[PDB]
Amino acid sequence: EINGPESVLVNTYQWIIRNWETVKIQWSQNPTMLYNKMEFEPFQSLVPKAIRGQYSGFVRTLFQQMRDVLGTFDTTQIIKLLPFAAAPPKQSRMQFSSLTVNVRGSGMRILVRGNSPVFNYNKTTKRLTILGKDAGTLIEVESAVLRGFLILGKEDRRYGPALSINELSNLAKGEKANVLIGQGDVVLVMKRKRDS
């Protein structure tokens, strides 16, 4: 269905679920090829031109963190963020809690952690809904939310008051803090000793 921006989004994610068995493998083994797939061009046209590259740099880094940190594979996070990795990457130190696509003049937020009006995944039914439309069902520590950090788990009061995602510049490597990550949530994070 190519009736406007909403159709482009729904179809992009439908294509990923449809092709997930091959897409998974390529994501693991040959990501440049996956990111360069011409099927991500439509989605990319909806991503604000001024920030596409940074978004991609950001998402490419998260994906590498996931590849490097054993046991942190997260299918829905990979599916959600994948189209944003299709831009030529530009680096920054910026942390994004949401990634915007432009739908008829409106800037729609795809939240990096969790569900949003654009990307809603039902963990029980395994159904992915995209702006109201079914994109299909998925057949069966957070390493791909913040750039340079792992989310270790729920808030640990011992590490004190929660920082905003913006105040994490001040952490040393190996250091941990609570972070207001989005929604009602505070989570314990650790700045990584490795770069990805």
Numbering used by the authors: 538 to 677, 686 to 741
Task: Pull text from the paper.
The PB2 residue at position 627, which in nearly all human and avian influenza strains is either a lysine or glutamate respectively, is the best characterised polymerase determinant of host range and virulence. The 156 amino acid 627-domain is located between the cap-binding and NLS-domains and contains six of the seventeen host species determining sites described within the PB2 subunit: N567D/E, I588A/V, T613V/A, K627E, T661A, T674A/S where for each position the consensus human and then avian residues are given.
We have also determined the structure of the complete C-terminal region of PB2 (residues 538–759) which contains both the 627-domain and the NLS-domain. The well-structured part of each domain shows only minor differences from that observed in either the isolated 627-domain (RMSD of 0.5 Å for all Cα atoms of residues 540–675) or the NLS-domain in complex with importin α5 (RMSD of 0.78 Å for all Cα atoms of residues 694–738). The inter-domain linker comprises two parts: residues 678–685 form a poorly ordered, flexible region while residues 686–692 form a well-ordered interface between the two domains. This interface comprises 11 hydrogen bonds including one salt bridge (Glu687 to Arg650) as well as burying hydrophobic residues on helix α5 of the 627-domain and on the NLS-domain. The complete C-terminal region, comprising both the 627-domain and NLS-domain, also includes the host variable residue R702K and, in the inter-domain linker, the HxN2 subtype host determinants S682G and S684A. The atomic structures reveal that all seven of the host-determining residues are located on the surface of the double domain. A superposition of the double 627-NLS-domain structure, assuming it to be rigid, on that of the NLS-domain complexed with importin α5 via the common NLS-domain shows that there would be a significant clash of the 627-domain with the C-terminal region of importin α.
